[PDB]
Design a binder for this molecule. Structure first.
Ligand SMILES: CN1CCN(c2cc(-c3ccncc3)c(Cl)nn2)CC1
Length: 276
C-alpha cells in the first residue's frame, strides 16, 4: 500500500516534540486547512532489506492497517498517512495530557477508586480491540495517554500500535516482544501468542497503579524476564496492607502463567472489583 507522498510541510506546521522512540519521533502539528492539531509520528524506514535499523515496510503497513480500523473513545485514531524516502508519517489524534506513567510519578500511587477509574477505561479500550481480534502486545503506563491531566477523573486513550497484530487463528507465532516488565510468560518463552498476553499486561499495570512498584522488576532485563517466566511476584505488605482483598484477587487472576487459565477481557469486566 502507498501513502501520500506530498511534502507533509505543505499541509501541516510542526511544533513541540511529544515523544521520542528507537525509530520514531513525535511532533505536535497543525493542519493548515482546518487549524486542527494532531500528533505527527515520524517512523524511520529501513534503507535495505538486510538492515536492523528502521522499521520494515511489512511492520509499518500492519500498524497502519490496524489503526485505520479503530474508532473508540479509549483508543487513538489515525487522521492521515504520509511518506517519503526516509519516513512514514502518521498523523494521529493529539492526546495532550501526558502519559499515565508521568501522572503516576506525580501521585506515587493511586487509591482503589482512582485506579479503577483508569482501569475501567483501559478495559473498555481493550474490550473493543479484542472484539476485533486485535492484540496490542505493548500495554504499559507509557502507552496510556490522558486527554487532560488537570481534571478529577482523567479520560485516557491507548496509543502505540507498533506491535499490534490481528489474531485470526486464536494465536500468532511471530517475532513479537515488548518491554520486559510488562510481557507475559508466553512472550518470554517464545510460545504462540494471543489476546491473553494483553490481560497479563493489565495485571502488571494494576499492580503498579495500586503500589507504585513493578511486580517482576529485576536489576537487569534478563532477571526481569526470568521473574516473569517463574511468576515471581508477591504483594508486599508495606505497599498493599490497606489494599482490598478483592483488588488483590483481580490481579491474581491476571498474573497466571497458563494463558488458558487467565481471565479474559470479558471476565475482567464482570469481576466483582470492576463490575458496578
Ligand atoms: C512509549 N512512548 C513512545 C513515545 N510516545 C508516543 C506518544 C505519541 C502521542 C500520541 C498522541 N498524542 C501525543 C503523543 C505517539 Cl503518536 N507516539 N509515541 C510516548 C510513549
Amino acid at each position: 500500500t502507498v501513502f501520500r507522498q506530498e511534502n507533509v510541510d505543505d499541509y501541516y506546521d510542526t511544533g513541540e516534540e511529544l515523544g521520542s522512540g528507537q525509530f520514531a519521533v513525535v511532533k505536535k502539528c497543525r493542519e493548515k486547512s482546518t487549524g486542527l492539531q494532531y500528533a505527527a509520528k515520524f517512523i524511520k524506514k529501513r534503507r535495505t532489506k538486510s538492515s536492523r535499523r528502521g522499521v520494515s515496510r511489512e511492520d509499518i503497513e500492519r500498524e497502519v492497517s490496524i489503526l485505520k480500523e479503530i474508532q473508540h473513545p479509549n483508543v487513538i485514531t489515525l487522521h492521515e498517512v504520509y511518506e517519503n524516502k526516509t519516513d512514514v508519517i502518521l498523523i494521529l489524534e493529539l492526546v495532550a495530557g501526558g502519559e499515565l506513567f508521568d501522572f503516576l510519578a506525580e501521585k506515587e500511587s493511586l487509591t482503589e477508586e482512582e485506579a479503577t477509574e483508569f482501569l475501567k477505561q483501559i478495559l473498555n479500550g481493550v474490550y473493543y480491540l479484542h472484539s476485533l481480534q486485535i492484540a496490542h502486545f505493548d500495554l504499559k503506563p507509557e502507552n496510556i495517554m490522558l486527554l487532560d491531566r488537570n481534571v478529577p477523573k482523567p479520560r485516557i486513550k491507548i496509543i502505540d500500535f507498533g506491535l499490534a497484530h490481528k489474531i485470526d487463528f486464536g494465536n500468532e507465532f511471530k517475532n513479537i516482544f515488548g518491554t520486559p516488565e510488562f510481557v507475559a510468560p508466553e512472550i518470554v518463552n517464545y510460545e504462540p501468542l494471543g489476546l491473553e498476553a494483553d490481560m497479563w499486561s493489565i495485571g502488571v499495570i494494576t499492580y503498579i497503579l495500586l503500589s507504585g512498584a513493578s511486580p517482576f522488576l529485576g536489576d537487569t532485563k534478563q532477571e526481569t524476564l526470568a521473574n516473569v517466566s517463574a511468576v515471581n511476584y508477591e504483594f508486599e505488605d508495606e505497599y498493599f496492607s490497606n489494599t482490598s482483598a478483592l483488588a488483590k484477587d483481580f490481579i491474581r487472576r491476571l498474573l497466571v502463567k497458563d494463558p488458558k487459565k487467565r481471565m479474559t477481557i470479558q471476565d475482567s469486566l464482570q469481576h466483582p472489583w470492576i463490575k458496578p
